[PDB]
Structure 1
Amino acid sequence: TTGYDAVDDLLHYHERGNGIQINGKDSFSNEQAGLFITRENQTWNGYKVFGQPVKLTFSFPDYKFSSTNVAGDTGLSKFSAEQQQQAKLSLQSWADVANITFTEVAAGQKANITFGNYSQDRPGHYDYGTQAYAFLPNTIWQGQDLGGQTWYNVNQSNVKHPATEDYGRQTFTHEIGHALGLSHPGDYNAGEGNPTYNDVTYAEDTRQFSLMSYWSETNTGGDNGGHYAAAPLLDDIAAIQHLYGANLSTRTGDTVYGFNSNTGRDFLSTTSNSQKVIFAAWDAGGNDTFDFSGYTANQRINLNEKSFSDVGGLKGNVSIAAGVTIENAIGGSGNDVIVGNAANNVLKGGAGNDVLFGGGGADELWGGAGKDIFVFSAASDSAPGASDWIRDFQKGIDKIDLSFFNKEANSSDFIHFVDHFSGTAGEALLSYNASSNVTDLSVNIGGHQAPDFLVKIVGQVDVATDFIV
């Protein structure tokens, strides 16, 4: 496979929406999913009141063991220090993406969102079967609003120890989701009390796209390696931003995700190959980097909005929220595929045999060690006046892949190398400056005397060995 083949495959990963079918099910766009997850139309600002900020209180009440909650469960207790710590991180992860402010109040004071443990389904009888539940805003029962109550079965080790059992942390984020107005992404009516993924309303109702789902990411071809996302995923972000608006103040500086992170978020950071990230990135400004340098697996990194990446040996585990521009990416020691976007991108392959694709804008490309391939598929990739730079080219080892053009022209003789331009479309010209150690690659794609494509290359290039055409 060419570099271009790999780029094309990553660009078309998890295509969705526009009426297509997947797994015999309707595919929804990110937007459609956000709307469907919020189909009850309930918010803390009112029924069908969307897009407005909200300020909410939360607490950890000191529930009495023999008391019975509204759902009939008993053996109640207050959240432990560990549970409180993890719940606050879950709250923060929702506040990061939408215009929600959370303020803690005292255990005995009325609060919008509450957290409690229960252990028994009836007095003296421990429940080992259930996990957790919560009430959406404006859930009126016997005259009282149950909205905001969240309840967890502390007999489950993950609920008791969410700091070391990542399904517990996910459960906290999920149930807070309900408390804010999110539903499961389907009702699963056809499953009649024993539902499976086969009963979804839309194909992207899986844990790849939403932590409001209970269906494995494997149903959509994801693979999270036995781990569970801590924080809102791509379609959860669409949902909650529909409800309370997008948080334009979040991470507006130059932000590094992954290794060497300055996010101050556990779920956006790692300090070792064994620590695997799973996240959907929301970022409201600045020059940002996906630093996945410390992973040894073969990775695929796509910097386009709404797109999925294969990071740290997982599949479809990293994504970028709608409306977000991430500028830079750093691969690991594996053989990576790294795809930029229309902005200026710094792309670094690291060790391994990498494929780099800057796309539009003026990109800076570093293959690193290994046999790397730099791919181009439009004159606008590297326009004169905004040229890409390949900073580390090694002749006989690295390659420039222009193969898209002859494939599109269906002619082996469209791109070809000449010693001087004649105005004929397809002509490519190399010019080497031994004094500056810079090679210019100029191509006349559009058919003018002046070329419309110019790549600047640090290093010599050997035309006999270094191209894929």
Structure 2
Amino acid sequence: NSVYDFLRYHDRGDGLTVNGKTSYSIDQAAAQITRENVSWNGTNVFGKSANLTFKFLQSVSSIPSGDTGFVKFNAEQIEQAKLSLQSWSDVANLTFTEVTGNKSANITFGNYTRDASGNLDYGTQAYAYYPGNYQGAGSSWYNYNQSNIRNPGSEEYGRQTFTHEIGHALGLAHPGEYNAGEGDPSYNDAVYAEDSYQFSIMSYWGENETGADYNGHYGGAPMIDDIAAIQRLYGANMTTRTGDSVYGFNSNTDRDFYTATDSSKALIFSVWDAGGTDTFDFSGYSNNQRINLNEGSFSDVGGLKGNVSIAHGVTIENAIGGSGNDILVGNSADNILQGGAGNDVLYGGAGADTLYGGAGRDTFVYGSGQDSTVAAYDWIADFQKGIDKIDLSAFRNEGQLSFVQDQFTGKGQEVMLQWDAANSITNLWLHEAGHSSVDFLVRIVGQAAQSDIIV
């Protein structure tokens, strides 16, 4: 039943209540984040692309906030800021072009170090201005007295702050009515339950407020609701990673937040992918992981909780677990699932899936007849007789499954294992109640015993 619960991991909307707060769906959160109804295309303009310019100020006549002690961006800030911009243009129909000299720009970057009174400010972090035609519109500012701001490449909060402020400069607002300086807001003030770093980088609250746990890390890229929100304003970018993309270990994304170079690296991201056959490669971790390929769902990767999610409108096809005891849940597409070492639970779901339990005592689960129809049957390519198991207990709801040796009686709800000596393939047939013909089939590359089947 671990599959059942995991499938409902972090359910939202549908009149639910989480943490005593109203639960919002991705779109409701996205609408809330774009409530200011402002973008670089104007007010109340949705689904329209934009070609924007950005500039690293070398000097200023004044900072629109009144803050003083201007300091230009250093090399590392410049590189990290470009990565943040890229994480936004990757998902929304936006293009960023740098301008220098006297040319004006839609989005600007600059640091400050003192307040209007001329006193050192080592307490604040950063802020930005919404798009518009007013003086300073789209400008973003950061406190140079903060080490995370000076070293955004080594201090994760810095990079996250860049992405956050750029979010404002693009038209995104905090999930709720609250802002630094104004009193002392908290998650208790959140308009909806999903107002945390787990769903939006535009939030003020840690992922822990929603049950997630990134072990002190900060994802520096747009999360699931941020993606929906930014696309609501500028449209989705359908040209991003349209080939076969691999996320996690052995990544070919050339994106730091989608890449893990070794087991000690933390992964925190919401994936946007516009095409191809893709893979969630989390093979380098030894932690027990829970991987869900359903769009909009969250996964527990590398020892963290709720650190990985799939954006709405995205189809990820494959997943590879680690040496831990994992749970891999596929989607309606044809998935290739690899559990790796450890005792894993694989659930292909709808579609013709190919499953590899890997080393260990693995379990291949089937929740219904639609999971492996004859017209699009599953393949279990490395089944180990007497070690792995095939769970068909879900069929009990319509009558306890009975085993038959070489013939079906017709009473339905019977399971048969057929050995193909010539090809060394075992065909698992299931004649379901209500079905006039045998419509369930799982082909197995290897031998299987009646005692390997759970009914």
Range of TM-score over shorter length: over 0.9
Query: What residue number does 2:419 align with?
Result: 432
What are the within-5 Å matches in structure 2 for residues 336-355 of structure 1? Answer: 336-355=326-345
CA distance in 2: counterparts of 1:208 and 1:448, whole angstroms: 44
> 1:125 offset after TM fit, Å?
2.2
Query: What residue number does 1:126 align with?
Result: 120
CA distance in 2: counterparts of 1:296 and 1:98, whole angstroms: 35
- Give the residue type in structure 2 aligned to 1:75: G
1:30 aligns with 2:29: no
CA distance in 2: counterparts of 1:352 and 1:455, whole angstroms: 23
CA distance in 2: counterparts of 1:194 and 1:335, whole angstroms: 42
- Give the residue type in structure 2 aligned to 1:248: M
Deviations along 1:32-55, one digit per CA (max 9) or x if unpaired, are 000100100001001001100001
The count of residues paired between Structure 1 and Structure 2 equals: 453
1:218 aligns with 2:208: yes
What are the within-5 Å matches in structure 2 for residues 360-375 of structure 1? Answer: 360-375=350-365
- Give the residue type in structure 2 aligned to 1:467: I
1:14 aligns with 2:10: yes
CA distance in 2: counterparts of 1:123 and 1:184, whole angstroms: 28
What are the within-5 Å matches in structure 2 for residues 3-152 of structure 1? Answer: 5-63=1-59, 68-122=62-116, 124-138=118-132, 144-152=134-142
Deviations along 1:55-113, one digit per CA (max 9) or x if unpaired, are 1000001125xx64111111111100100000000000000000011000004321110
1:416 aligns with 2:406: no
Query: What residue number does 2:198 align with?
Result: 208
CA distance in 1: counterparts of 2:212 and 2:350, whole angstroms: 28
What are the within-5 Å matches in structure 2 for residues 270-309 of structure 1? Answer: 270-309=260-299
CA distance in 1: counterparts of 2:43 and 2:367, whole angstroms: 49
Query: What residue number does 2:443 align with?
Result: 456
- Give the residue type in structure 1 aligned to 2:108: T
2:38–2:130: 8 Å Cα contact kept in structure 1? yes
CA distance in 2: counterparts of 1:242 and 1:145, whole angstroms: 26
CA distance in 1: counterparts of 2:101 and 2:141, whole angstroms: 15
> 1:131 offset after TM fit, Å?
0.3
- Taking a change above 3 Å as real, the CA distance of residues 449 and 70 of structure 1, as seen in their structure-2 partners, is closer
CA distance in 2: counterparts of 1:444 and 1:78, whole angstroms: 71
- Give the residue type in structure 2 aligned to 1:78: K
CA distance in 2: counterparts of 1:116 and 1:346, whole angstroms: 47
> 1:385 offset after TM fit, Å?
2.4
CA distance in 1: counterparts of 2:220 and 2:372, whole angstroms: 39
Deviations along 1:296-349, one digit per CA (max 9) or x if unpaired, are 111110000000000111100000010100000000111100000000000000
1:424–1:447: 8 Å Cα contact kept in structure 2? no
- Give the residue type in structure 2 aligned to 1:447: G
CA distance in 1: counterparts of 2:251 and 2:213, whole angstroms: 23
Query: What residue number does 2:169 align with?
Result: 179
Query: What residue number does 1:326 align with?
Result: 316
- Give the residue type in structure 2 aligned to 1:457: I
CA distance in 1: counterparts of 2:136 and 2:150, whole angstroms: 24
Q: TM-score, normalised by structure 2?
A: 0.97
2:298–2:306: 8 Å Cα contact kept in structure 1? yes
What are the within-5 Å matches in structure 2 for residues 186-197 of structure 1? Answer: 186-188=176-178, 193-197=183-187
- Give the residue type in structure 1 aligned to 2:23: S
- Give the residue type in structure 2 aligned to 1:121: D
- Give the residue type in structure 1 aligned to 2:91: V
- Give the residue type in structure 2 aligned to 1:34: A
Query: What residue number does 2:306 align with?
Result: 316
> 1:188 offset after TM fit, Å?
4.0
1:62–1:108: 8 Å Cα contact kept in structure 2? no
Of 226, 236, 241, 1:251 maps to 241
> 1:121 offset after TM fit, Å?
1.2
Query: What residue number does 1:236 align with?
Result: 226
> 1:436 offset after TM fit, Å?
1.9
1:61–1:108: 8 Å Cα contact kept in structure 2? no
Deviations along 1:248-285, one digit per CA (max 9) or x if unpaired, are 11110110011111111111111100011100000010
> 1:192 offset after TM fit, Å?
6.8
- Give the residue type in structure 2 aligned to 1:102: F
CA distance in 1: counterparts of 2:298 and 2:140, whole angstroms: 31
Aligned residue for 2:418, secondary structure, equals strand
2:322–2:339: 8 Å Cα contact kept in structure 1? yes
366-375 or 418-427: which moved more? 418-427
> 1:124 offset after TM fit, Å?
4.7
> 1:118 offset after TM fit, Å?
0.4
2:126–2:165: 8 Å Cα contact kept in structure 1? yes
CA distance in 2: counterparts of 1:81 and 1:108, whole angstroms: 20
CA distance in 2: counterparts of 1:287 and 1:261, whole angstroms: 14
> 1:123 offset after TM fit, Å?
5.5
428-437 or 95-104: which moved more? 428-437
2:64–2:135: 8 Å Cα contact kept in structure 1? no
Q: What is the percentage of aligned positions where both structures have the same residue? A: 63
Q: TM-score, normalised by structure 1?
A: 0.94
106-115 or 286-295: which moved more? 106-115
2:144–2:150: 8 Å Cα contact kept in structure 1? yes
Structure 1 gaps of 5+ residues are none
1:351–1:370: 8 Å Cα contact kept in structure 2? yes
CA distance in 2: counterparts of 1:293 and 1:159, whole angstroms: 33
CA distance in 2: counterparts of 1:9 and 1:283, whole angstroms: 26
Of 348, 363, 386, 1:358 maps to 348
